């Protein structure tokens, strides 16, 4: 629901941790997130029709 | 009273349009874009992913 999305915003997280080679201890991290998409626009097309289930 | 076409244009130009709700005393941000021009990438699969990220 909207509240749990409001306080936990990011849906996925993929973290890669690599070493700086030849410089020991120094770690190199890529932290990539995918947030919740918030509804910001749509196009609508309407059509009368018969025969529809 | 910014009409909604004018609001979407201000949103594409990187502006935050404070829009008055007509007949009320309340206002709203329909959009909060930042300045940076949204890039156009080629219309492939990887291109639409990179536009999505951008």
């Amino acid at each position: 629901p909207a509240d749990v999305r409001s306080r936990r915003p990011l849906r996925a997280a993929r973290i890669e941790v690599m070493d700086v080679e030849g410089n020991p201890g120094w770690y190199q991290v890529s932290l990539s997130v995918r947030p919740h998409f918030k509804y910001m626009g749509a196009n609508f097309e309407l059509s009368l029709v018969g025969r529809l289930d | 009273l910014i009409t909604d076409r004018k609001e979407f244009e201000l949103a594409e130009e990187g502006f935050i349009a404070l829009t008055m709700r007509k007949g009320s005393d309340n206002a709203a941000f329909f959009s909060a874009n930042s300045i940076q021009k949204p890039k156009v990438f080629p219309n492939t699969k990887e291109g639409k992913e990179a536009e999505t990220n951008y």
């Binding site: 749509a42 196009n43 | 909604d4 979407f8 959009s31």
Partner: protein
């Protein structure tokens, strides 16, 4: 025009199309079986050449 018109693009674009979506559907008028009755209809020859004299539409409502 023939495609209708739309507003300039907003946050919520609503337009109505013929939503049947009938691909492989084209429109034709039922073509009239236009019978061209050609016969001797006046008491004389006309000097006017054949390409210039005109056809006369006849129905029940203006035959007289």
């Amino acid at each position: 025009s023939k495609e209708g018109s739309v507003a300039p693009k907003e946050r919520i674009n609503i337009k109505y199309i013929p939503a049947t979506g009938d691909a492989q559907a084209e429109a034709e008028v039922e073509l009239p079986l236009k019978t061209l009755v050609v016969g001797d209809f006046k008491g004389h020859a006309e000097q006017t050449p054949l390409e210039e004299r005109a056809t006369v539409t006849v129905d029940k409502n203006n035959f007289e």
